[PDB]
Protein backbone atom coordinates (compact mmCIF):
# COMPACT_ATOMS: atom_id res chain seq x y z
CA UNK A 1 0.00 0.00 0.00
CA UNK A 2 1.21 3.49 -0.81
CA UNK A 3 0.86 6.35 1.69
CA UNK A 4 -1.49 9.21 0.94
CA UNK A 5 0.67 11.85 -0.82
CA UNK A 6 0.30 14.87 1.47
CA UNK A 7 1.69 14.03 4.91
CA UNK A 8 4.62 14.78 7.24
CA UNK A 9 6.92 11.76 7.16
CA UNK A 10 10.06 12.78 9.07
CA UNK A 11 13.68 11.66 8.91
CA UNK A 12 13.28 8.05 7.69
CA UNK A 13 10.34 6.53 5.86
CA UNK A 14 6.55 6.85 6.10
CA UNK A 15 6.47 4.25 8.89
CA UNK A 16 6.70 6.90 11.61
CA UNK A 17 5.03 10.26 11.11
CA UNK A 18 5.98 12.14 14.26
CA UNK A 19 8.98 11.36 16.54
CA UNK A 20 9.15 7.54 16.33
CA UNK A 21 10.54 6.71 19.77
CA UNK A 22 13.18 4.00 19.65
CA UNK A 23 12.05 2.34 16.40
CA UNK A 24 15.15 2.09 14.17
CA UNK A 25 15.05 0.60 10.66
CA UNK A 26 18.00 -1.64 11.60
CA UNK A 27 16.26 -2.71 14.81
CA UNK A 28 15.41 -6.26 13.74
CA UNK A 29 17.41 -8.99 15.46
CA UNK A 30 19.29 -11.69 13.55
CA UNK A 31 18.76 -14.86 15.64
CA UNK A 32 14.96 -15.08 15.62
CA UNK A 33 14.47 -18.40 17.39
CA UNK A 34 11.41 -19.87 19.15
CA UNK A 35 12.09 -19.82 22.88
CA UNK A 36 10.76 -23.37 23.29
CA UNK A 37 11.10 -26.40 20.99
CA UNK A 38 8.19 -28.52 19.78
CA UNK A 39 8.91 -31.68 21.82
CA UNK A 40 6.99 -34.17 19.66
CA UNK A 41 4.94 -36.79 21.49
CA UNK A 42 6.03 -40.44 21.14
CA UNK A 43 4.14 -42.55 18.63
CA UNK A 44 3.99 -40.25 15.60
CA UNK A 45 3.73 -42.71 12.68
CA UNK A 46 6.38 -40.92 10.57
CA UNK A 47 9.37 -39.94 12.74
CA UNK A 48 12.85 -41.44 13.07
CA UNK A 49 13.38 -40.05 16.57
CA UNK A 50 14.48 -42.44 19.31
CA UNK B 1 -11.88 7.55 6.56
CA UNK B 2 -10.28 10.15 4.29
CA UNK B 3 -12.54 13.17 3.92
CA UNK B 4 -12.32 14.98 0.55
CA UNK B 5 -10.53 17.85 2.32
CA UNK B 6 -7.66 16.02 4.04
CA UNK B 7 -9.05 15.68 7.58
CA UNK B 8 -8.34 12.06 8.57
CA UNK B 9 -10.49 10.87 11.46
CA UNK B 10 -9.43 7.69 13.23
CA UNK B 11 -11.97 4.93 13.77
CA UNK B 12 -11.59 2.00 16.14
CA UNK B 13 -8.40 -0.08 16.11
CA UNK B 14 -8.23 -3.86 15.90
CA UNK B 15 -5.92 -6.60 17.18
CA UNK B 16 -3.98 -8.86 14.80
CA UNK B 17 -4.80 -12.47 13.98
CA UNK B 18 -2.03 -15.04 14.27
CA UNK B 19 -1.74 -18.80 13.90
CA UNK B 20 1.43 -19.69 15.83
CA UNK B 21 3.45 -18.30 18.74
CA UNK B 22 6.97 -17.93 17.34
CA UNK B 23 9.79 -15.40 17.01
CA UNK B 24 10.62 -15.51 13.29
CA UNK B 25 8.93 -13.47 10.58
CA UNK B 26 5.26 -14.18 9.94
CA UNK B 27 2.07 -12.60 8.61
CA UNK B 28 -0.38 -10.76 10.85
CA UNK B 29 -3.85 -10.60 9.32
CA UNK B 30 -6.59 -7.98 9.65
CA UNK B 31 -9.75 -9.09 7.81
CA UNK B 32 -11.46 -6.32 5.88
CA UNK B 33 -14.75 -7.48 7.42
CA UNK B 34 -13.73 -5.94 10.75
CA UNK B 35 -13.36 -2.44 9.34
CA UNK B 36 -16.38 -0.16 9.09
CA UNK B 37 -17.72 0.14 5.53
CA UNK B 38 -16.11 3.59 5.27
CA UNK B 39 -12.46 2.67 5.94
CA UNK B 40 -10.38 4.31 3.20
CA UNK B 41 -7.00 4.50 5.00
CA UNK B 42 -5.15 2.57 7.69
CA UNK B 43 -2.00 2.80 9.80
CA UNK B 44 -0.09 0.67 12.30
CA UNK B 45 0.02 2.02 15.86
CA UNK B 46 2.75 -0.12 17.42
CA UNK B 47 4.42 0.24 20.82
CA UNK B 48 6.19 -2.03 23.30
CA UNK B 49 6.15 -0.75 26.90
Is residue B49 within 8 Å of residue B12, measured between CB atoms?
no
Q: What is the 3-state secondary structure (H, E, C) of chain B?
A: CCCCCCCCCCCCCCCCECCCCCCCCCCCECCCCCCCCCCCCCCCCCCCC
What technique was this entry resolved by?
cryo-EM
CA distance B31 to B11: 15
Choose the closest CB to A34 out of B22, B42, B44. B22
Nearest CA to A16 out of B14, B8, B39, B45 is that of: B45
Q: Is A34's CB within 8 Å of B24's CB?
A: yes
Amino acid sequence: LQPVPGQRFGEYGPLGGEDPVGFTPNGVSDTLEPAEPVAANPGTPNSDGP
Amino acid sequence: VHRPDGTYQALSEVQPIDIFQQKAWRNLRFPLAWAPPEANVARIVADDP
